[PDB]
């Protein structure tokens, strides 16, 4: 499939001080403005030189894994996807397309939702790896209200080993700038990109456009 969703719009890159969590970037994936119909989508690829610091905040999560590689085409690439029940980490010779995303849709006679991964990749020829364990992310808590929870990660690739880190802490101040796991013996990495989750329905009539939609999402990035 691989429908096209990108939009001509571009915005000047914002930046903020790290404040000892620097010249950290700041991106907006789904952006809304006064003109209520302005839904925009853009997930550019970013360099991966030595290491990356990742953080985000979400009301109801739409963030599922990442993709890493050098060519990002059928000509290898590490892929991660995480869902509500279990995480899966796989190394495979995937064939991606310009606008990868994870789609979900209704199932009329089974009274449940289902997720289709074929919107991300087309071919997985002669492919081996697979892993399973408890999920990295989680979207439930014993409290709901004004305060939110903040996530963070660190990736480094030294001596051939691949390693991950993560911590969870809630905020106590009003909304502002940032307050102030496994080891996989996997490849040459120089780029990566995050992938979102989108959902569709048919309740409304005469929707002469693509039905993919979701809420607003943002995240931070930095280098070592």
């Amino acid at each position: 499939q691989c429908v096209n969703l990108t939009t001509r719009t571009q915005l000047p890159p914002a930046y903020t001080n790290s404040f000892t969590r620097s010249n950290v970037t700041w991106f907006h994936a789904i952006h809304v403005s006064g003109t209520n119909g302005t839904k925009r989508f853009d997930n550019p690829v970013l360099p991966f030189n030595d290491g990356v610091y990742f953080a985000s905040t979400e009301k109801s999560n739409i963030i599922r894994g990442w993709i890493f590689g050098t060519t990002l085409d059928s000509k290898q690439s590490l892929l991660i996807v995480n869902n509500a029940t279990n995480v899966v980490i796989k190394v495979c010779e995937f064939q991606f397309c310009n606008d990868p995303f994870l789609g979900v849709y209704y199932h009329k006679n089974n009274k449940s939702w289902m997720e289709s991964e074929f919107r991300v990749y087309s071919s997985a020829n002669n492919c081996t790896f697979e892993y399973v364990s408890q999920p990295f992310l989680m979207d439930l808590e014993g409290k709901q209200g004004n305060f939110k929870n903040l996530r963070e990660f660190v990736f480094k690739n030294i001596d051939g080993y691949f390693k991950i880190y993560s911590k969870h802490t809630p905020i106590n101040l009003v909304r502002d700038l940032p307050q102030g796991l496994v080891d996989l013996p996997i490849i040459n990495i120089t780029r990566f990109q995050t992938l979102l989750a989108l959902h569709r329905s048919y309740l409304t009539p005469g929707d002469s456009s693509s039905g993919w939609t979701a809420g607003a999402a943002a995240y931070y990035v930095g280098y070592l």
Epitope: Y105, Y106, H107, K108, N109, Y202, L203, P205, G206
Partner: antibody, heavy 120, light 108 residues
């Protein structure tokens, strides 16, 4: 944007049976309901049957029940319907309609097909 | 079952009202919708939920439900477009979705 296309015209002799096929594109049949409607020349529309979101079944009109049958196949993404015991007065155009798949009990048919004609 | 006055007529630029009626169970405890039938063409939805137009082409229309009667109209009619119009809904008692007889709009 769903676009529907179906089989070309058909002819038949008295007392036989005929089948009509309707196809979809864009969306997939597993998240849409299907209905069938017929109109006699100048006599107005008439409802044949369809899928009821209230429960998982297929219910037919009280008048024609037993003379028809419906089936679906998802691999090719095409819906099928059959008609039998054709009689003297049976002749009309046949339309393939779709609508909301998960409303409690609602009726807003859209879109429709280009139409097929069956002669008896 | 339902009834509807056939073959209404009007002059261009004037108001026009179409009346569709039913019984307590036929049209009372449900919504309605209105379709138009250009000759030699499949119908095209116009109104749903008794007052809500779909996005895009549909022009401004209205509908009120006086218990078991509903009406549709347009402030001004034109010869640019004109065809048959139909009413129909889901009967709630011992019945299924039914359609009315229709009325052949006439423009001088």
């Amino acid at each position: 944007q769903v676009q529907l296309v179906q089989s070309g015209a058909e002819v038949k002799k008295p007392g036989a049976s005929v089948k009509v096929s309707c196809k979809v594109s864009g969306y997939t049949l597993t998240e849409l309901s299907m209905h069938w409607v017929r109109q006699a020349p100048g006599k107005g529309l008439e409802w044949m049957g369809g899928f009821d979101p209230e429960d998982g079944e297929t219910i037919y009109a009280q008048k024609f029940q037993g003379r028809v049958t419906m089936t679906e196949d998802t691999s090719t993404d095409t819906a099928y319907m059959e008609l039998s015991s054709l009689r003297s007065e049976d002749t009309a155009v046949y339309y393939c309609a779709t609508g909301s798949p998960f409303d409690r009990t609602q009726n807003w048919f859209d879109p429709w097909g280009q139409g097929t004609l069956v002669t008896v | 079952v339902v009834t509807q006055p056939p073959s209404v007529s009007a002059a261009p630029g004037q108001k026009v009202t179409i009346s569709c009626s039913g019984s307590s169970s036929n049209i009372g405890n449900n919504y309605v919708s209105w379709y138009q039938q250009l000759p030699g063409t499949a119908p095209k939805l116009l109104i749903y939920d008794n007052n809500k137009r779909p996005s895009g082409i549909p022009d401004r229309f209205s509908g009120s439900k006086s218990g078991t009667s509903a009406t549709l109209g347009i402030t001004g009619l034109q010869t640019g477009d004109e065809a048959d119009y139909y009413c129909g809904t889901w009967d709630s008692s011992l019945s299924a979705v039914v359609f009315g007889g229709g009325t052949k709009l006439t423009v001088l």
